[PDB]
Design a protein around this ligand. Structure first.
Ligand SMILES: Cc1cc2c3c(c1C)C(C)(C)CC=[N+]3c1c([nH]c(=O)[nH]c1=O)N2C[C@H](O)[C@H](O)[C@H](O)COP(=O)(O)O
Ligand SMILES: Cc1cc2c3c(c1C)C(C)(C)CC=[N+]3c1c([nH]c(=O)[nH]c1=O)N2C[C@H](O)[C@H](O)[C@H](O)COP(=O)(O)O
Ligand SMILES: [Mn+2]
Ligand SMILES: [Mn+2]
Ligand code: NA
Ligand code: NA
Lengths: 488, 488
């Protein structure tokens, strides 16, 4: 029974290979990320890299008694273990979750392990920078970062509407963090209403959570539109309302079973340059694998209190690599699968928000042509995917005999089941995503501005009429165990 | 020092994970290939499959005392070990060997372990089908097959011109094998000449060899033109001439340290249907991953003698999967690397004949743009690759910060470093390869006949002017070993 991060870790230890610890000292500045890069960062991280175990650094240089956990979500198999299904059915398992959310439930403070220790910021010696080791990913980061900070805010005019979102948080002062919100972010709608009335917006930052909470929170419109508490997707994954606690210093709720809580308020009118103390010009690595630039004008969170468990674990990520692939990719897959299943029932077999696209840019669709009229529906599925998730860039379509989670098998379909002048459709001038550096007028004359792209559909499905000629060579079905028992 | 198969096996046993044995009885008909499909076939083989150890089946049902080895070359890492270099530098290492061949030498029978046993076919009790297990790959194969039969033959007008090639051989009678020779093959030139004179062509079939010999043999023109004895490549790989021996019954040389040798003659005028005894309509699986159709008219080899070591190993393959990727792909890489380095010195960093194309259809070229004039040379390198290896189909160009052996990283370059209406060039109507089933007029109206293709170049290199914007997020250089010694 997984209710929080420690129970999640306990399960990983019953599956050797998914969790390791180290007592060898590590510097949270750059060096920690440098080590996990080789061990389990994965995703779009510059090679050498791999997926591996979730990793707990127990001796943090300069922070005795702290312990930093990274890579908890940095594997599709591990995410499947933590959620209780097989990795090939996460798209369907998460898909059914978002469409049957279970609302969270408030709990008294005596049942909130997060509040076992309280450090009020009005203490003269309080210093967030000495209190928690916020690691940096690269030596050219804007500063120390919290990268798995699940921020919880609400509409200041309608308390009933609450939104939770992961945002990168840069420690800027002893009691201040900057926070980046992209255009049209759902919490930004709350802050702008607060700022326009000259009022601060109370928020809580919740770190070190049940993996179910982080994963369920990363949906986007139109799948989870404005007004959809993303809490409850977690409630559907656990068949259990996540538990909330009333904040010890702000008029806002915090997740009771979290490891560390930061209570604060978004301040009206205030803006800071994200790299003001570093002047590196960069924020931190983005999910496509490149360095994001330092945001010149960010809102500020004024910390009112920090609240944490005894021997609190600081959970964050590195890369963001495969951890981002899982958090962003499984909502992506669930959204596409739900949409195609509504429009063409029974046709789509599976979908993979490929890690090469960070879980957002590259969609692999596995279809099954069952009848002559299914020819021509593979392109329709690609259109539905592009319509459902506008930040997609490319679609690869394959049949049910291609393993869409094996990139060699994907390239195989692109080699023997495609003709370049037949199977490739380009859609110029469609808005995509700012963080793809090839989406620039400097890359293509058909691109009118940053974050606009040509989008490409690679149809690697066998034409219906030719399917009898493209059967993969069949081998006798045997049980190989007796000839190699140790290999299982 | 490796000079035959068993010295190669001895090396693999010093690197655990690369060689296993089993004494559990196995049926060479279909069952053996079915087991190794799950264990080490890899490549384009129908999932589930993987690369693993080379595997020796010590108990062969119906052939007591026989033992069959498969998968010797079914791993790029295994191949680099057997050749004595790092897998990333195989293209350079094999490339230099083909440019500096070492000619084979003749030795007396006393130094030819292949001739420890001699079985003459004119014995009334001789039966090729009882003497050696010839495993099949699928239940629908044309018949028993030898899939690592390195055929050695010479020109009937000039016996100094020797060629050596792997051809698939189906056991048809107690003393006959059918042999498929594609059009334009070098040994086929010798065969057509002998048949035009109404005379047989003496051949030796050499099975169970130094991996350097099998790999070195799989070159094609123009890299190894007609007249180039490919045994010189193996000689350069070992810095030791391959040793030849006079056959016992045919006027042709045999590989002295081979495990099994079939001496025979290609009969003039005789033709046979490959599946005459099974009528399956199929031959065996082909490297693109589909089942080939039976050939209705093949020349036959009249077996004159079989010649073996004591406790001889019969070496063959399954899939052909990753074993074919290694055997065809390493010369493909070497051929391309030599051509590009001659034309554009210093530009090409590496090349991968991707396993998704069986080592023939898909070429990944890794280039490094060093100066503004290198812009536009990435497409030139693709043209050189296409001109050097006409059976290539598609080329993917990437920069030196992309791991060309990581298919995830390849798809990443295809996602963030590619614009569909900019980076994709199609070349319709270029002769490709018959065994790509999409190279058919039924797949594309620009294809005039079977084995003609559209060939496509995916330029996923960063445009020179934009290189400062496409730097991958830099993580601090650390030695990760002290934080997880067990995983290094
Ligand atoms: C998973 C994930 C999502 C990040 C993200 C990160 C991760 C790991 C970081 C921490 C590594 C770096 C940047 N993050 C930001 C981000 N969106 C944003 O506006 N600012 C961000 O700083 N996102 C994307 C955002 O969280 C998702 O798109 C949500 O679905 C948006 O939810 P919403 O529609 O309710 O606003
Ligand atoms: C590695 C390999 C190459 C095969 C091959 C196989 C393998 C494993 C088999 C055993 C799995 C089944 C088919 N094979 C044949 C073949 N060429 C051919 O003409 N007939 C064949 O049957 N080839 C290709 C041939 O070996 C290469 O193209 C040589 O480079 C041709 O050399 P050449 O120019 O000297 O004739
Ligand atoms: Mn939302
Ligand atoms: Mn030749
Ligand atoms: Na949200
Ligand atoms: Na040859």
């Amino acid at each position: 029974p997984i209710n929080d991060l420690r129970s999640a870790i306990a399960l990983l230890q019953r599956h050797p290979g998914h969790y390791i610890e180290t007592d060898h000292p590590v510097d949270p500045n750059a060096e920690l990320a440098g080590v996990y890069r080789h061990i389990g960062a994965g995703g779009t991280v510059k090679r050498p890299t791999r997926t591996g175990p979730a990793m707990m650094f127990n001796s943090v240089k300069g922070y005795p008694g702290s312990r930093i956990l990274v890579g908890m979500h940095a594997s599709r198999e591990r995410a499947a273990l933590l959620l209780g299904c097989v990795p090939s059915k996460l798209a369907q398992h998460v898909g059914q979750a978002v469409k049957n959310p279970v609302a969270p439930v408030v709990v008294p403070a005596s049942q909130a392990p997060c509040q076992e220790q309280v450090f009020y910021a009005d203490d003269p010696d309080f210093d967030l920078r000495k209190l928690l080791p916020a690691p940096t990913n690269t030596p050219i980061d804007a500063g120390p970062f919290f990268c798995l900070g699940l921020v919880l805010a609400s509409d200041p005019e309608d308390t009933s509407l609450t939104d939770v979102t992961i945002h990168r948080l840069c420690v800027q002062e002893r009691d201040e963090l900057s926070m980046f919100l992209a255009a049209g972010r759902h919490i930004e709608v709350f802050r702008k209403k607060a700022e326009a009335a000259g009022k601060p917006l109370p928020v809580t930052i919740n770190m070190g959570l049940d993996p179910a909470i982080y994963i369920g929170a990363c949906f986007e419109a139109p799948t989870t539109p404005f007004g959809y508490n993303e809490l409850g997707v977690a409630g559907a994954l656990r068949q259990q309302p996540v538990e909330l606690v009333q904040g010890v210093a702000v008029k806002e709720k915090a997740i009771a079973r979290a490891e560390i809580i930061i209570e604060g308020e978004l301040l009206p009118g205030v803006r800071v340059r994200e790299d003001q103390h570093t002047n590196t010009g960069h924020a931190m690595p983005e999910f496509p694998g490149y360095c994001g630039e330092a945001n010149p004008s960010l809102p500020v969170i004024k910390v009112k209190a920090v609240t944490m468990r005894n021997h609190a674990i600081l959970q964050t990520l590195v890369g963001p690599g495969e951890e981002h692939t899982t958090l962003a990719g499984l909502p992506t897959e669930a959204s596409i699968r739900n949409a195609v299943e509504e429009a063409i029932p029974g046709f789509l077999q599976n979908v993979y928000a490929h890690t090469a696209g960070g879980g957002k840019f590259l969609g692999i669709l596995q279809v099954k042509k069952r009848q002559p009229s299914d020819e021509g529906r593979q392109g329709q599925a690609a259109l539905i995917a592009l319509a459902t998730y506008s930040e997609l860039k490319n679609i690869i379509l394959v049949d049910e005999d291609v393993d869409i989670f094996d990139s060699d098998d994907i390239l195989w379909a692109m080699t023997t089941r495609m003709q370049g002048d037949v199977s490739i459709t380009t859609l110029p001038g469609i808005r995509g995503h700012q963080l793809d550096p090839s989406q620039s007028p400097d890359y293509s004359t058909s691109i009118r501005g940053n974050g606009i792209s040509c989008k490409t559909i690679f149809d690697c499905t066998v034409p219906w009429a030719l399917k009898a000629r493209f059967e993969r060579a069949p081998f006798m079905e045997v049980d190989p165990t007796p000839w190699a028992p140790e290999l299982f």
